[PDB]
């Protein structure tokens, strides 16, 4: 397919844009899930994320079905859930979510917040973790917790790129 890589962004302040919304969730729920997903990474780095409402941002977020632009098509219900590109121009940093999945803010289907937090990891330069319990593990696992703690494997990875936070 169409691919972009660099190890990391050369700046600490990044922009994102929610291009379109899944019908499974409300605009407010989708916006909250993505905002928390960026918070996972800005809590432990100097990274900052600013949301844009039009134009082109560093991280363009969109929901698509099957072939959607990059010739890495989705596969319908289940299987591939999402993917994202490493840092760089154009597609670099972008996050794609398969809208053939039922996206929820809870546990009914696939948790948008969890998947997005993982993909934004990739958008920042992270690879997959060899640890099945790390966020960046490629297999989707639902936690069932009323909160999310970013595992240490994921903190060390993102801090090796951008350094620590507060």
């Amino acid at each position: 397919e169409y691919n972009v890589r660099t190890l990391k962004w050369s700046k600490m302040n990044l922009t994102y844009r929610i291009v379109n919304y899944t019908p499974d969730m409300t605009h407010s729920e989708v916006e909250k899930a993505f905002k928390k997903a960026f918070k996972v990474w800005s809590d432990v780095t100097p990274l900052n994320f600013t949301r844009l409402h039009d134009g082109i941002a560093d991280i363009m977020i969109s929901f698509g079905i099957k072939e959607h632009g990059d010739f890495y098509p989705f596969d319908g219900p289940s299987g591939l859930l999402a993917h994202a590109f490493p840092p760089g121009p154009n597609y670099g940093g972008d996050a794609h979510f398969d809208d053939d999945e039922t996206w929820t803010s809870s546990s009914k289907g696939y948790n948008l917040f969890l998947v997005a937090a993982h993909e934004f990891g990739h958008s920042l330069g992270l690879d997959h973790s060899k640890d099945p319990g790390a966020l960046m593990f490629p297999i989707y696992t639902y936690t069932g917790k009323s909160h999310f703690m970013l595992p240490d494997d994921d903190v060390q990875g993102i801090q090796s790129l951008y350094g620590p936070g507060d």
């Binding site: 591939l80 859930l81 999402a82 993917h83 993982h118 490629p138």
Partner: peptide, 5 residues
């Protein structure tokens, strides 16, 4: 990349 099942 996230995968289920």
């Amino acid at each position: 990349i996230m995968i289920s099942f």
